[model samples]
Target: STGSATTTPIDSLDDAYITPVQIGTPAQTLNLDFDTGSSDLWVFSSETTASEVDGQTIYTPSKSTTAKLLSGATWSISYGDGSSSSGDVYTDTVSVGGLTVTGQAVESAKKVSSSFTEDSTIDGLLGLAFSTLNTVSPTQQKTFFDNAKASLDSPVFTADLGYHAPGTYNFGFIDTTAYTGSITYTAVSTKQGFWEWTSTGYAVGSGTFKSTSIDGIADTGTTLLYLPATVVSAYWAQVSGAKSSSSVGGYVFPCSATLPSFTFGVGSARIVIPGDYIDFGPISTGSSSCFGGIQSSAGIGINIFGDVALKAAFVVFNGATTPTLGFASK
Candidate 1:
């Protein structure tokens, strides 16, 4: 038997995997973005200026009897969504489902960027990556998973994401019933403090799997699948009237255009992304146009297997040894 806790992620209008995290003494619950690509548990708080906080709920340290200010300690973070938050630190009990860690370092925000200002539902981010990536100044703190892993039966966590449906993130052990077919395991490389791995290659439409290697990170915080510019261009070429424009952003296509199924290789397994899922959503401000979920990862240096890719398959982030990533199609 394994000591673990699992929580269903809420569906965000913006495609975020938001989970509820309880912080402080009496427990003030806030919905946070459970990010695997980053390592900091920061939240909007009373410390944040009124103007920067916007519509998001804030955590008040003073309201918790167990809260203790960590004088001089501070943290900050920036995401691809252009959202960022920075503030001081407080030590308190933080819990998710049945998993709880006391005296956990919680970074409370004092300021935030525009992206955060507009998205009020997500109070902050709960990083599940290694503590080495923590952004706190002076001294980094351990994430909830690290603080509680010692008591678990196995050093493993799992992500069971589905299409537009609530998904579950488990800590300490894998839920065998969540996925079908034996999980295909692939070695992981975490030198960049990320769950990095190389996919053998990908094929467009129903084509055969190619032998090209693509290195990238598994980022649940991001919404789209970012691949190389060449790959993105080639796929869009198959669709009529698909072109890059500053006005529409990324590659925009007609709302009714038929698309090809995108297949990405994970070692020997082929992770197929359905053709219709390629249509992300509408480009705001009106038009019969839609944004391509697969875009160029040119500036980011590495391809991002974000929500678009993660939700397409069952993924496992094994912290047990060598940190391997496992994949399975349901």
Candidate 2:
């Protein structure tokens, strides 16, 4: 079986994307971030303190007849910014599009960071990354994707993200019409529970494509494209009035400057990211300096091919016995 779900940008800046998912017996719909960076299908719930609950929707497990406590199970996930969320676990009926997974583990948030409480648009996160990353203690749980893989037509899913537009996430089958060129397949490493792959090389605008192996994860949850310091330095150098700003915490450029496009290779194909996409909105509401969508992953150890890069192509996360990642221009 195959299922497809529409995902929309949560805000004008495309900070994050969200998709509706049905959970529990009566099926309450909640907008969730389909994150490929981390694995743990967690949601805000009645268990969360009221202070942490802003205007976001909450999942009430007590209200669902199919909900069952995953006895003594608990989960927690921390972010790079020192923010985190953790809670207890429950098994419930979870559905994405029309695909259903009974007894899927759902982490109910008992506490959340201020960042999450401030963002009322997203109710939770539906992890699409490898289940090895699941944070549930004792007996770890499987992700939504992992739980549904066996029943799918094929153990695979595709991400077609858009810029300020609604995109689609398809499970089990790849939509031929979603992409333009023939797909370029690359080997993926689940070693660290990410859809990590090696990008052949990169080019700045019309610059020649350099021949180098760039390892990174295709993360739909991250908003920016993070590459090596040298690679990003080359990119930012091309833009006039661009500089690494300590106050802003990244490379920033004049909002009116003409930015160069970025290109990265997969197999023999090169995927190009438009210049405008790099000009992420102004630093402040009316600031002249704009933060770049491409940043250096110096301290992060590994590079990240985030939404800024994924938005340029249609990506496939193939979960065969030997997992592989496929990229195609659209």
Candidate 3:
């Protein structure tokens, strides 16, 4: 039998969403970001220096009788956003929603970057991606989902990401009420430890779909959509006053400027991204200049269907036999 949990977004961070996870014997509850972009379950721990610890809750391994130090095992990771953390390893009982896994590899943070240390609400990341991408040395680690998948009734999870509103992450099952219309399926490339898929093509506004292959990942942790340079250039070309700025590293436009809708394909359905979300946010305070959320993936090698794009649809990251992606209207 498979059990599921509904994870909700926090109070006000538009870009942040977390799931409650219990670790160790006594059940140290931590609100962790459910990140599919990276692997390795890490947490702010007792090993973290006092100077580095801020408003975040720290997990105490010493208090958990079942915790065992993985002597030589260590870990480190860097995100596409440039936030990074490093730490030692431990084996403990970890539970998410209602599913539990014994002897799970829990990487405890010993050091963290200013980006993470400053974010008081985020305890750490619960990586749902493939275990092969885990960072622990000597022996890589298996994510909680990986260790628990065999026992799951369905072996799937759904991401119901919403815009500037409460969203949900459902584990082990799919709820039909969470989405509207038929779910469109797209095969993914699990080789990179991401829910990666390719686009048949995209079009600006209600125009005809232009067919092209665009490979990218469905990343919830990311806040904005990133595309190929040429594609991004095409997106901005429609913005009357928008222009690229090397200083800002992106295109910025007047806040009140009207933007056309963005449409992309998943199977044969034309998935659309609303224009308001494309404005991203103001480049500086008290200014009308705003950055275009759609930027270049020139150096990143792959496009990112970040929260902006994902929030527009109900998505299923099905890790069953073929690791397929299912999308539907919200």
Candidate 4:
């Protein structure tokens, strides 16, 4: 059984945000953001001269009691949102909770753009995703999980996302107390990097997918589900007054009416998403109308089942023993 752990909301401090956990024994506290979209632990340094970063916590390794920099190595990352940052490689003793993990690889950004530098509240990102996107060698040298897994009290790691009420995101040591019943574990498919499952078809209300089925990949990085145009069009058609709105970027429909529930079959497992998840933000066409959940990212050529889809499930990444991911109940 999973134990229930108290999840606290991360408060935005000044231009930087700090995790409740500090680094090192005589800890030099650093601010970081929990980003599941990418898998790289990086922080900003005082060396960065970018004017956009006016008030942000920049780590100074020289000032710290224990810190090491990787010689002659540089790294850069670009996000789907068109934001990018470049930095030098360094090694440090990273401490989370009461556990201290030494020789942990970290990146220090020297050249940052407005997209990254302007966000002073987000000092650095603590990537809790997979190690597939790692810049370091053998996949073992990069991920935060890979580095910290050995020191963890339990083999399991859990994420409690408090999107509502205080919005606290907690990690490390699965709280077995939270598991009131047996956890349903699903084996991860290695064919794709993301947690993927083969779906026969999608059903909205009474309407169901007829012939061709679709593949869905669970992606925490993305905010919206990127579905095929055919699926998107068919879904909106079911809503009585729903219409495709080009200006809003997806299907728009009246919010007053109760939207139909959507369900998908993944092998033998049945996954259903409520209408509330599909009903997005407000639309300009009508005050009561709002955008639908499914969006048209046809050119992208892949379906991304974002966090909204996985919020109900307790996700565990099994990188300690092998390169595997497991999904179970909260």
What lDDT tens digits, residue by residue, belong to model 1 across residues 155-269?
Answer: 7777776676677878777778888787888878888889888888898897766788888998887788999998888788888888887776689888788988898998888
RMSD of each: 1.9, 0.8, 1.8, 4.9
What is the per-residue lDDT of model 3 for residues 1-330, given as tens digits with 9 covering 90 to 100? 454555555543355777788999899999898887878899999999779889899899999999999989999999987888999999999987788899999999999999888988889999888888899999998988888888777788788876667677776888899887899999899888888999888898766678899999998888778888888888888888899999988889888889888888898886788887686677877889988878888888889988778878988888887889999987
So what's the TM-score on candidate 1?
0.94
What tens digits encode model 4's per-residue C-alpha lDDT throughout 32-91? 765555677778777676575767777777776767767776777776657777777777
| Ten-residue stretch with the least lDDT total in model 3 | 5-14
- Candidate 4 at 256: error in angstroms? 4.5
Rank candidates, lDDT, best first.
2, 3, 1, 4
**Where is model 1 poorest over a 10-residue stretch in terms of lDDT?**
1-10
TM-score of each candidate structure, all chains considered together: 0.94, 0.99, 0.94, 0.75
**Best by the TM-score measure:** 2
Clashing residue pairs for model 1? none
Query: CA lDDT of each candidate?
Result: 0.82, 0.93, 0.85, 0.60
Better lDDT candidate (1, 3): 3
